[PDB]
Amino acid sequence: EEKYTTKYDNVNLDEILANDRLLNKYVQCLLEDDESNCTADGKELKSVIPDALSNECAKCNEKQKEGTKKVLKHLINHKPDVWAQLKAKYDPDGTYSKKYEDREKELHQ
Incomplete structure (x- = not known):
């Protein structure tokens, strides 16, 4: 499959992280019991995250x-x-997600 630059009707990745209103829709894709929420770029972004x-x-x-x-x-x-x-x-064992989660470690003791 061919690949191209990250642009769609004046949206880029720089707006995704900067705009939590976008981000919350993109995460709903795997957080909820349904997947109707998965955006046109969001479904591809979340599918390469585990890769x-x-x-x-x-x-x-x-x-x-x-x-x-x-x-x-x-x-x-x-x-x-x-x-x-x-x-x-x-990451059901925390074997590699912990490598950069440690920057905040929001799981209180």
């Missing part, structure tokens, strides 16, 4: 390789309560 853990995004284009890696850090800092739902489904 950054399965194969370090080695199959990806450079925009995804940098993109999900930067977005991960913002999401754990700005959506800590919803991030705990991502890493629980995506």
Whole structure:
């Protein structure tokens, strides 16, 4: 499959992390008991997020390789309560999500 730059009707990744109103819809895609919420770019973004853990995004284009890696850090800092739902489904042993969760470690002792 071919790949292209991250633009759709004046939206980019820089607005996704900066605009939690967008971000909350993109996370609902795997946080809720339904998946009707998964946006046109959101469904692709969330589908490569676990590939950054399965194969370090080695199959990806450079925009995804940098993109999900930067977005991960913002999401754990700005959506800590919803991030705990991502890493629980995506890393049920905490073997690799803990590597950068430690920057905030929102799970109080």
